[PDB]
Amino acid sequence: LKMDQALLLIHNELLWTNLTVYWKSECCYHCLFQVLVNVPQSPKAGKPSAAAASVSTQHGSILQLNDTLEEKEVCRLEYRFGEFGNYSLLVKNIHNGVSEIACDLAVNEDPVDSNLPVSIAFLIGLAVIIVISFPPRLRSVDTFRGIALILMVFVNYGGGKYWYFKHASWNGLTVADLVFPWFVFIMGSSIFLSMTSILQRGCSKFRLLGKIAWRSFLLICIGIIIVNPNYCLGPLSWDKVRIPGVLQRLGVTYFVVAVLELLFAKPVPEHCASERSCLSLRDITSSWPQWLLILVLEGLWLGLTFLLPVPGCPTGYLGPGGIGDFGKYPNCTGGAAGYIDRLLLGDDHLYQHPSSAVLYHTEVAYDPEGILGTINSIVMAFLGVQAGKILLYYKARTKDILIRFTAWCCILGLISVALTKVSENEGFIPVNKNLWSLSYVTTLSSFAFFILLVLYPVVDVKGLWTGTPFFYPGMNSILVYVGHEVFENYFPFQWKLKDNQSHKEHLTQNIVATALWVLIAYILYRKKIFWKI
Amino acid sequence: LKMDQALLLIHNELLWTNLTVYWKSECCYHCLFQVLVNVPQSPKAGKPSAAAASVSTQHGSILQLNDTLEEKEVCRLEYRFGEFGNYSLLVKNIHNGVSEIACDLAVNEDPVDSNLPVSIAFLIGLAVIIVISFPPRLRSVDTFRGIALILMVFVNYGGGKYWYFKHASWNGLTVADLVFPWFVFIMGSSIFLSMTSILQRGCSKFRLLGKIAWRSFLLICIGIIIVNPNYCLGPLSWDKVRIPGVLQRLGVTYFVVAVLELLFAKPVPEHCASERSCLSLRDITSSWPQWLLILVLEGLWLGLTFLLPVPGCPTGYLGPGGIGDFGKYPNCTGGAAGYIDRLLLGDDHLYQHPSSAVLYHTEVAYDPEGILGTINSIVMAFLGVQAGKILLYYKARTKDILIRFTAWCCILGLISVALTKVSENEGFIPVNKNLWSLSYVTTLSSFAFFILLVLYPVVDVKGLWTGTPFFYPGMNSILVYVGHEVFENYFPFQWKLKDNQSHKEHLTQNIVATALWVLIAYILYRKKIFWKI
Numbered sequence A, B: 001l002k003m004d005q006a007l008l009l010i011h012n013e014l015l016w017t018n019l020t021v022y023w024k025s026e027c028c029y030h031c032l033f034q035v036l037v038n039v040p041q042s043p044k045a046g047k048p049s050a051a052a053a054s055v056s057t058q059h060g061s062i063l064q065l066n067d068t069l070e071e072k073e074v075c076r077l078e079y080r081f082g083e084f085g086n087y088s089l090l091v092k093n094i095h096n097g098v099s100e101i102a103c104d105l106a107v108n109e110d111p112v113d114s115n116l117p118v119s120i121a122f123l124i125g126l127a128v129i130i131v132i133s134f135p136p137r138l139r140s141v142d143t144f145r146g147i148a149l150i151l152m153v154f155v156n157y158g159g160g161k162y163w164y165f166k167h168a169s170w171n172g173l174t175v176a177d178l179v180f181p182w183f184v185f186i187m188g189s190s191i192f193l194s195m196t197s198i199l200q201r202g203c204s205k206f207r208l209l210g211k212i213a214w215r216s217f218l219l220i221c222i223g224i225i226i227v228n229p230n231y232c233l234g235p236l237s238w239d240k241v242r243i244p245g246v247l248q249r250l251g252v253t254y255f256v257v258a259v260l261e262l263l264f265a266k267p268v269p270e271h272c273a274s275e276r277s278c279l280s281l282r283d284i285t286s287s288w289p290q291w292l293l294i295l296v297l298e299g300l301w302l303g304l305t306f307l308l309p310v311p312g313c314p315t316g317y318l319g320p321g322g323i324g325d326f327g328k329y330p331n332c333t334g335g336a337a338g339y340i341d342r343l344l345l346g347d348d349h350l351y352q353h354p355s356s357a358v359l360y361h362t363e364v365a366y367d368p369e370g371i372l373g374t375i376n377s378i379v380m381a382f383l384g385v386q387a388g389k390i391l392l393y394y395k396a397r398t399k400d401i402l403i404r405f406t407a408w409c410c411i412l413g414l415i416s417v418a419l420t421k422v423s424e425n426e427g428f429i430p431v432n433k434n435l436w437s438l439s440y441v442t443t444l445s446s447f448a449f450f451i452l453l454v455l456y457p458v459v460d461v462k463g464l465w466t467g468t469p470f471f472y473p474g475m476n477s478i479l480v481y482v483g484h485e486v487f488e489n490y491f492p493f494q495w496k497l498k499d500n501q502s503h504k505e506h507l508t509q510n511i512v513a514t515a516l517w518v519l520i521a522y523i524l525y526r527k528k529i530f531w532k533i
């Protein structure tokens, strides 16, 4: 018995009905019934036949008995199983009245509760906090980036082998999905904050364009050579290299938004601040040509995804392949993004095993961070640029900045509610990390606005907290990222586990590895070593 | 047919003699005859039986036919085989006179000459040189260390799969063996050069001892955690960790010689220089107490190796195990060093596969850099300290320093000749890297004295060469070492080879990797980034 399983042995007593047991989870959307076990017929009178099977306990189970010769369903039960439990399903015949078939399930051994280590760890963290309590840079931006870094290091090392510290298979939001867009939002803000400071004191655009180009080139080089390939399985060879990647995506969106802001730059007006609703939206109207291009790119993304003809697959398709959507479309994982990507780069230059495979059973390859999602990344980086413009235009009165942050958060939350139709698998556009939906960027940017609204009158102005954890990694992000990608298997971060089937046994190791990375970040702050790409 | 092999098919014509073919290489010392092929008897008249076998071409071959039923040797031939050649051995019966058995060997396909890429590469290097031609630091020490670093990076990546760019199996000296002791000699010199400068300007011994201790601790930590374990094969676990290592050895010898010089330090006498033979050996007589301890440690090493009783093995044994020494002692790879090491640390905490295994066929484990060789490392580091004392005592006249270097080189060369008895496998103490012989340290220190004698009136005084290659890696040694140990499988250094059986195909890749490391060292010099443990 492995993790998230429960031995289910079935006893069948009926004289002459050879039985089939089917299975399907409760979360899987429009999924066919596969097979679990085929119990044998009662060989002799009063000596029932028995079979053994294993059922997953991560989500609820639907179990169907359907016979072998015929189709009439003998029984169905829908129930939820706990980890490492002897459960006993009995199917019998009811003597009273007409002949009837009934199923009774009895627990032999009780299961084991699995959220106890999470509870214990979070109370111990609260107790430790209770014992502990008794060209300027901006503190709030650095604090938020540090929180994103500790979440990324913890989730990428290991979630404790938990399903809610892991990317969802399709059409869902978890703790793991939240981390990546916030980096893009911070990156756009940092673009505006750096660029306004360099253009002042005297500089040339010809000077700055080389810097932008060189940064983009270096990021594209670092991702392909170092981060992507697995160098334990063999020497690197072309026709087997993965070109799409996270650093290439960051580099291309950085190049586009940086050049686009550099072309249309205007000096910041003095005494720009006014009372609320009396500004005349001067921050908005100073960016008049650059909004139009972003609208054209979003119109292109909508039109391409919904209306492009694709051979074999339906023309606009958002669902998974394989078993999902009833196995009518057994390829078509990507849709119109997958066809575009599988006509230019190739099919061998893509990520072989996607997240959707484990539940939806899709054979064909998909890349989470490839082509046609870059447009939405540019849109969200522009939103971060918009936040950065707000901070430097109106920084006389605190009340003004809070009003803009509140209004922007409410309007983005309203559009993401209206598009999502407040569900998970329904609506015009669902929220999905793999396709980089407009709903996805629209819901996480509102959370970023709310988090900045909470932090700014505490960590940055009129201090009530020193923000002491979470800016020490914030200053050095690229060292931490390359460090955990290169040094992942080394001894202080990882060691051999003498029980491989415990959530409890993994969680402490991942927590210690995250704490060690925070300690390394703290040592480098005191030694005043900062590296910037 | 793989590298360094040659297909040898044998034709036997005799009517009734079933034959055995034996094999033994020409370099292997007191080695038994194993089996190569068992050809079958002539089944019919005039229809000879045939067999196929492969013979290695790295060294010469001795081939014996000895029959199966009896013992009378049918024939023997001793010859040298070339790579990838059809050779044809015929054994027949001579009709004339008495019955006689003769063997004739005829070449069907000529072999391929294998030193052509080395010749081509070294002429191309000469042609490139011909095209190219038309608290102070000391330059000569840095230049010598850089040469040692490029040799170490080239040999450790790959020798071109050549036997003379690789450690010898036992009792031998190659290009690969020379690299490591020179680092210890440079290290001892750098100890004296730093220590005399820090004691002047005002300092305390209590201040310096912590620095020495901290450096030793860090080196011991770096070697065990990072350099030794192979982290692709599994997570690290104790009872399977290798404690002996190169960095631990450097750390312990550094601690001993640094503390020993710090205890007995005396200020450098002004106007110490004199005419040759008129100094009264003042450099020698200022170190009077510290010579005695080194003599006691060397006496301990000699007495322990020659006279310690060891169970099962002979009491003082220097030979290999397995097949070597005629298979009389089938264990006893280590001797009295192996027993001492296999009684303290363990047998699981040792290096599993030694260099001697491929030719001598030894099953038992040995560690090249463990316990009881540390004493000789301390002796050679003290010799480097002695060279450093010569440079600062007598640096008024150049002629004086040259006379001391010449005399020291001649006396060490004379002792290493007298001990080695100018042979390879004979003498009282042979030269061996694995046991760290007195002969080994005595012969390489003389070469270090000669190389310093050549470099010092050229690179350091009265320049005729700028030493432009070989000091750029010399300043940063620890970064280069940790860099090639961690980044060994990455793309610019290594790539997939579409022919795996060519010396020519490997050599270019290793040369390019060495040149890239020299380029990285050059970039860091201009950027003025220097790190010191």
Ligand SMILES: CC(=O)SCCNC(=O)CCNC(=O)[C@H](O)C(C)(C)COP(=O)(O)OP(=O)(O)OC[C@H]1O[C@@H](n2cnc3c(N)ncnc32)[C@H](O)[C@@H]1OP(=O)(O)O
Pocket: A136, A137, A138, A139, A141, A142, A152, A156, A179, A180, A183, A186, A187, A190, A191, A193, A194, A246, A250, A475, A477, A478, A481, A532, A533
């Ligand atoms: C599921 C997953 O795996 S999610 C994967 C995502 N995780 C990653 O780590 C991806 C890698 N990304 C990164 O490391 C970072 O996002 C970066 C470094 C590439 C960019 O983030 P940035 O905010 O731009 O960082 P960085 O510090 O390099 O910023 C560069 C400039 O911004 C400036 N800056 C940054 N923060 C601030 C601030 N708070 N105030 C003012 N200026 C700032 C810097 O001074 C610098 O300007 P300069 O070079 O002109 O002096």
Ligand SMILES: CC(=O)SCCNC(=O)CCNC(=O)[C@H](O)C(C)(C)COP(=O)(O)OP(=O)(O)OC[C@H]1O[C@@H](n2cnc3c(N)ncnc32)[C@H](O)[C@@H]1OP(=O)(O)O
Pocket: B136, B137, B138, B139, B141, B142, B152, B156, B179, B180, B183, B186, B187, B190, B191, B193, B194, B246, B250, B475, B477, B478, B481, B532, B533
């Ligand atoms: C087969 C194989 O694999 S062989 C394996 C061996 N190869 C290796 O790379 C092993 C690793 N060893 C090393 O990297 C080096 O030997 C080291 C760094 C550990 C030590 O070598 P060192 O000569 O001591 O190097 P390093 O530069 O660190 O020397 C430290 C001190 O010497 C001083 N120094 C070094 N060279 C000189 C010089 N020419 N003149 C004056 N001072 C010098 C430095 O200034 C420093 O003094 P400070 O810290 O007080 O300012």
Ligand SMILES: *[C@@H]1O[C@H](CO)[C@@H](O)[C@H](O)[C@H]1NC(C)=O
Pocket: A022, A033, A034, A066, A071, A072, A073
């Ligand atoms: C089980 O039987 C039901 C009803 O007869 C039928 O609808 C269903 O397709 C069957 N399941 C499978 C997997 O054949």
Ligand SMILES: *[C@@H]1O[C@H](CO)[C@@H](O)[C@H](O)[C@H]1NC(C)=O
Pocket: A086, A108, A109
């Ligand atoms: C409970 O599980 C164990 C697992 O080995 C099994 O042997 C035992 O038969 C189960 N109990 C019952 C009543 O089946």
Ligand SMILES: *[C@@H]1O[C@H](CO)[C@@H](O)[C@H](O)[C@H]1NC(C)=O
Pocket: A330, A331, A363, A364, A365
């Ligand atoms: C797509 O589905 C077909 C069956 O309709 C299958 O044969 C094919 O192998 C699938 N594609 C891949 C890449 O496996």
Ligand SMILES: *[C@@H]1O[C@H](CO)[C@@H](O)[C@H](O)[C@H]1NC(C)=O
Pocket: B022, B033, B034, B066, B071, B072, B073
């Ligand atoms: C081969 O025969 C010779 C002479 O009869 C004998 O000395 C030798 O031991 C034999 N070799 C082997 C391996 O038996």
Ligand SMILES: *[C@@H]1O[C@H](CO)[C@@H](O)[C@H](O)[C@H]1NC(C)=O
Pocket: B086, B108, B109
């Ligand atoms: C030469 O080598 C080839 C290798 O395939 C072999 O087939 C051929 O028979 C050899 N020549 C002779 C004359 O045996």
Ligand SMILES: *[C@@H]1O[C@H](CO)[C@@H](O)[C@H](O)[C@H]1NC(C)=O
Pocket: B330, B331, B363, B364, B365
């Ligand atoms: C040492 O030799 C004996 C045979 O004499 C052998 O059984 C043993 O396994 C050898 N040692 C090792 C470690 O293999």
